[PDB]
């Protein structure tokens, strides 16, 4: 009859090495924003955003990923 | 009949090494925001945002991830 | 009949090493915000935000994650 | 008659060991200086300094000193 | 008569060991300086300095010194 | 009569070891300087400096010094 064996071996390495990481400068929305509006009409939903929003500075010293799926399926 | 064996072995390493991480400078919304409005009409929901919102500075010394799914399914 | 065995072994390591992490500077909403409004009409809900909101400085010395699902399902 | 011998032996060691040195911030700055002057008289030499001068940030990884005089004097 | 011998032996060591040196920030700056002057008289030499001068950031990885005088003097 | 011998032996070592040196930021700058002057009189020599002058960023990977005088003087 059936014999199933699932012995995946993983000795992998994901690695980084950085001497110095820095002087990073992110200046979004330095400029002037003006928004003049006269005699508008809206009959359905309005979303508005005005200015500096959702700006990201992401500086991981590492930032390394490993993703590993295993799946053994039997019917 | 059936024999199933599930012995995945994992000796993996995700790693980072950083000497010095710094002088990071994030200045969102330095500028001037003006919003003038006259004679508007709204008949449904309004969301508004004005200014500096939701700005992120994320500086993990590591920031390393490992994600590992295992699944053994039998019918 | 059936024999099922589930012996996943995990000796993994997620790791970070940082000498010095610092001089981080986050200045959202430095600028001036003006909002003038005359003769508006609203007939449904209004949300408003004005200024510096929800701005994040997140500086984990580590910030490393490991996520590991196991699932053994039998019908 | 005279016999003079000068055999100083020196096996000294000045030493340091520092893992990580960092996150230094020096601000001799962002100053208002005002200097108003009327009807002054000077009859001998004048030196003047006004502002941010001679400010130092000194960050030697070691910074160790050894100073060693020898002197053999005879009349 | 006279016999003089000068055999100083020196096996000294000045030493440093630093893993990581960083994230330095020096700001002798962003200053207002104003200098208004009326009806001054000078009869001898005048030196003047006004502003940001002579500001130093000195970051030697080592920065170790050894100073060693020898002097053998005879009359 | 006279016999003089000068055999100083020197096996000294000045040394440094630095893994990583970095993220330096020096800002002697972004200054307003104003200098208004009326009705001055000078009768001897005048030196003037106005602004950003003589500002130094000095980042030697080593920066180690050894200074060694010898002097044998006879009358």
UniProtKB/Swiss-Prot annotation, chains A, B, C, D, E, F:
Site feature location: Not glycated: 7, 13, 17, 27, 36, 39, 66, 71
Tau/MAP repeat locations: 2-32, 33-64
Modified sites of kind Phosphoserine: 1, 20, 48, 52
Residues with the Omega-N-methylarginine modification: 45
Cross-link Glycyl lysine isopeptide (Lys-Gly) (interchain with G-Cter in ubiquitin): where in chain: 7, 13, 17, 27, 39, 43, 49, 65, 71
Modification sites for N6,N6-dimethyllysine: 7
Record note on what altering residue 65 to I does: In PIDB; 90% reduction in the rate of microtubule assembly
Subcellular location: Cytoplasm, Cytosol; Cell membrane; Cytoplasm, Cytoskeleton; Cell projection, Axon
Modification sites for N6-acetyllysine: 7, 13, 17, 27, 39, 43, 65
Free-text comment about domains: The tau/MAP repeat binds to tubulin. Type I isoforms contain 3 repeats while type II isoforms contain 4 repeats.
Disease note: In Alzheimer disease, the neuronal cytoskeleton in the brain is progressively disrupted and replaced by tangles of paired helical filaments (PHF) and straight filaments, mainly composed of hyperphosphorylated forms of TAU (PHF-TAU or AD P-TAU). O-GlcNAcylation is greatly reduced in Alzheimer disease brain cerebral cortex leading to an increase in TAU/MAPT phosphorylations.
Subunit structure: Interacts with MARK1, MARK2, MARK3 and MARK4. Interacts with PSMC2 through SQSTM1. Interacts with SQSTM1 when polyubiquitinated. Interacts with FKBP4. Binds to CSNK1D. Interacts with SGK1. Interacts with PIN1. Interacts with LRRK2. Interacts with LRP1, leading to endocytosis; this interaction is reduced in the presence of LRPAP1/RAP.
Protein's recorded name: Microtubule-associated protein tau
Lineage of the organism: Eukaryota, Metazoa, Chordata, Craniata, Vertebrata
Residues of the full protein shown: 622 to 696 of 758
């Amino acid at each position: 009859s059936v014999q199933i064996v699932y012995k995946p071996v993983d000795l992998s390495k994901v690695t980084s090495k950085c001497g110095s990481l820095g002087n990073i400068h992110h200046k979004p929305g330095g400029g002037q924003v003006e928004v003049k509006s006269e005699k508008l009409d809206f009959k359905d939903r309005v979303q508005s955003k005005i200015g500096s929003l959702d700006n990201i500075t992401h500086v991981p010293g590492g930032g390394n990923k490993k993703i590993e799926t295993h799946k053994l399926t039997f019917r």
